[PDB]
C-alpha cells in the first residue's frame, strides 16, 4: 500500500538571552534552513530499501521548526517509512550534497575556518548542527533536537581609565583551523597537528550602541599552550597572549579583552552554554 510521509520538525539547543536559559528551541531558525535527514536504522528490517535511499535528504525551514522536504521540479522526495516497527534517523545542518548520498568523504566533511567564516551571513554556513531521533514511527510526526556541535571563542572588549574603544583588526594566531564534522555521528573535530603560524582576521567594527564584541565559531580543539591575540585600532598595535583552554563541543568561551592604557589585558571569563547575537 501507500505510506504517507513522516513530518519533520526541529529544535536547537541554546542560550535564549531574553530568559537567560538553555532550551530546546524551534522559534530560532533561519527562513531558507536545509538539513540532511538519513534512515539510519529499521528496528524491523535489518537490509531494508529505506536505510540505503533515505540518506541526507534534504528538507528547507518553512516557518518555525518545521520543515518540508525539497522538491525542485516533478519529484516527491518525500521519506516514507513503512510498516509499524521504530526507525532511527539521523539530521544535521547546514545541508551539503545530494540526496541518496552521505555528503563530503563517507559523511566527513572537510573545512577551514577563516575570519571571512565569521561575518553575520558567513558564519551559520559553519554552524554545524547534529540531531538524533531514535523510536521514530512511519506516517508520524518527528522534531529532531539538534544541538551545536561546533566551539566558539566570544572576545568581549573594554576600555577604561581614559582608554577609547575604535574599529579594529584583529588577529588570533596558531589556532587549528582545519578540521571535519561527520553527519553520522555528529562528530565535529579540529584536525590533529600543531599549526603555530596559522592566523585568523577579522574587521571589527565600533557599533553604535552596546558591547563591543567578536565571537569565532571554530573547531572543537584544545587549545596549544601559545595563542597570540593581537589587535590593531585606531593606527596602533597590541598583542598579548590568551589564558588557553579545552574548547569542547557545544559550548562558548567568552574572554573579557580590556584596554586599560596604554595595556590590552586578557582574562577568561566562565564558560557558557551557546551564546548566540540577539
Ligand atoms: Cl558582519
Ligand atoms: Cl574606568
Ligand atoms: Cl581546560
Ligand atoms: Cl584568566
Do not use: C
Not at 32 to 46: C, K, L, S
Not at 111 to 130: E, N
Not at 183 to 188: F, K, N
Amino acid at each position: 500500500r501507500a505510506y504517507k510521509p513522516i513530518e519533520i520538525y526541529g529544535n536547537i539547543n541554546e542560550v535564549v538571552n531574553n530568559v537567560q536559559e538553555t532550551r530546546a528551541v524551534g522559534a530560532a531558525w533561519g527562513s531558507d534552513d536545509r538539513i540532511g535527514v538519513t534512515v539510519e536504522a529499521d528496528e524491523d528490517n535489518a537490509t531494508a530499501n529505506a536505510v540505503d535511499t533515505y540518506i541526507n535528504i534534504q528538507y528547507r525551514n518553512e516557518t518555525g521548526g518545521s520543515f518540508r522536504v525539497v522538491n525542485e521540479g516533478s519529484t516527491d522526495n518525500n521519506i516514507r517509512l513503512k510498516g509499524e516497527g521504530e526507525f532511527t534517523l539521523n539530521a544535521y545542518y547546514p545541508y551539503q550534497g545530494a540526496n541518496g548520498t552521505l555528503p563530503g568523504t563517507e559523511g566527513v566533511i572537510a573545512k577551514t575556518i577563516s575570519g571571512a567564516d565569521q561575518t553575520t551571513d558567513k558564519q551559520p554556513q559553519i554552524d554545524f548542527l547534529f540531531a538524533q531521533a531514535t523510536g521514530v514511527r512511519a506516517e508520524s510526526p518527528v522534531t529532531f533536537d539538534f544541538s551545536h556541535k561546533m566551539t566558539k571563542i566570544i572576545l568581549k572588549f573594554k576600555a577604561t581609565n581614559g582608554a577609547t574603544l575604535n574599529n579594529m583588526k584583529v588577529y588570533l594566531k596558531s589556532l587549528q583551523l582545519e578540521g571535519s564534522f561527520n553527519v553520522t555521528t555528529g562528530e565535529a573535530v579540529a584536525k590533529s597537528g600543531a599549526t603555530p603560524n596559522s592566523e585568523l582576521s577579522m574587521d571589527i567594527a565600533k557599533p553604535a550602541e552596546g558591547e563591543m564584541t567578536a565571537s569565532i565559531i571554530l573547531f572543537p580543539q584544545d587549545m596549544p599552550e601559545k595563542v597570540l591575540l593581537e589587535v590593531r585600532m585606531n593606527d596602533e598595535t597590541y598583542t598579548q597572549y590568551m589564558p588557553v583552554q579545552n574548547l569542547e563541543s557545544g559550548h562558548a568561551y567568552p574572554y573579557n579583552v580590556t584596554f586599560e592604557n596604554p595595556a590590552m589585558t586578557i582574562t577568561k571569563a566562565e564558560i557558557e552554554d551557546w551564546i548566540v547575537e540577539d
